[PDB]
């Protein structure tokens, strides 16, 4: 019984840590140059937050972020990793002649022991749509090891939401579901499952990027401050919204992306996954509305996005929206855990 075990079905955990145990999956993240290079710059350009300090690396993976903490002059770095990648991080610590300064601690950060308090916690715990994986909660949990006035890198996270119109993406769903509207598929009438099929396809968030021209209003922002936030604050995430529509059209859903900021003593460095920035391995995420909404420029699209954490290391998402000038309404439920990867 740990904080982690109690929130997480074992079957999700096993699969989750199996994934990160592959060098190829670590490699996938490392090879995102925007991600890895921005982490390096944030750390190295704020060398005074690291020089001779004690550091904790939450989910170290291959060791990469802890090596950057060393490049920046850290005295001691505890690098915690729960997958079997832990063994491989130890091999690299030895081969880079850093055993005096980086200590790999295999295990969950919720379950291990640290020998002392740290000055700064570094992590990369952002899932797609920011919150997928529920690793933000591990990152927050780790603050039990942070000295008072200790820092967090990243320091804050902002999720952005904006309405979009993409008719072709919408119609993709019915095309796929209309497989089931066949009265004679090899002589079998499949039609009775067509609505269930539609609902299953509309429950999938869409991971890919897009042209910014699809966006119909300026985004609303929901900020998590990692210095201040508690684990519990991420079990129920409510994002109210009132969009002032800049373009007229059919709104087919909401688009999501995120930024994090490393607020260092020397400078604040941003890592953005926005569709205006270079592409990352996070892409962007769209949640479709199975009944889209007509809005004209000038209208207000109001509603709420409610993310409810579950024991599969993800969230049940409820999106409810209305055009205030007409009263027309759309209600949608998504399973964040099971996206469509459409870039592929």
């Amino acid at each position: 019984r740990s904080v982690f075990s109690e929130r997480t079905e074992e079957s999700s955990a096993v699969q989750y840590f199996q994934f990160y145990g592959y060098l190829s999956q670590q490699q996938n993240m490392m090879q995102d140059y925007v991600r890895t290079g921005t982490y390096q710059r944030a750390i190295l350009q704020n060398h005074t937050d690291f020089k001779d300090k004690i550091v904790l690396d939450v989910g170290c993976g291959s060791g990469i972020l802890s090596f950057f903490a060393a490049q920046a002059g850290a005295r001691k770095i505890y690098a915690v990793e729960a997958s079997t990648m832990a063994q491989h991080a130890e091999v690299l610590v030895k081969s880079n002649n850093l055993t005096d300064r980086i200590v790999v601690i295999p295990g969950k950060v919720e379950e291990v022991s640290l020998p002392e308090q740290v000055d700064i916690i570094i992590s990369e715990p952002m899932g797609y749509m920011l919150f997928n994986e529920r690793m933000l909660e591990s990152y927050l949990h780790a603050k039990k090891y942070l000295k008072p006035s200790g820092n967090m890198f990243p320091t804050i996270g902002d999720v952005h939401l904006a309405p979009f119109t993409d008719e072709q993406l919408y119609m993709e769903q019915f095309t796929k579901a209309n497989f089931w509207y066949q009265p004679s598929f090899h002589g079998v009438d499949l039609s009775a499952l067509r609505g269930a099929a539609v609902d299953e396809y509309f429950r999938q968030p869409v991971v890919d990027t897009f042209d910014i021209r699809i966006l119909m209003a300026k985004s609303v922002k929901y900020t998590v401050n990692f210095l201040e936030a508690k684990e519990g604050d991420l079990h129920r995430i409510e994002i109210p919204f009132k969009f002032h529509m800049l373009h007229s059209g059919l709104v087919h859903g909401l688009a999501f992306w995120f930024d994090v900021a490393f607020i260092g003593s020397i400078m604040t460095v941003w890592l953005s996954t926005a569709p205006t920035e270079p592409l990352t391995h996070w892409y962007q995420v769209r949640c479709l509305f199975q009944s889209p909404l007509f809005a004209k420029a000038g209208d207000t699209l109001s509603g709420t996005c409610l993310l409810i954490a579950n024991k599969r290391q993800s969230y049940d998402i409820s999106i409810v929206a209305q055009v205030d000038q007409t009263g027309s309404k759309s209600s949608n439920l998504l399973d964040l855990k099971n996206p469509f990867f459409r870039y592929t």
Partner: peptide, 9 residues
Amino acid sequence: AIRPAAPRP
């Protein structure tokens, strides 16, 4: 699926 595949340069 957990992390998506990094964009191919």
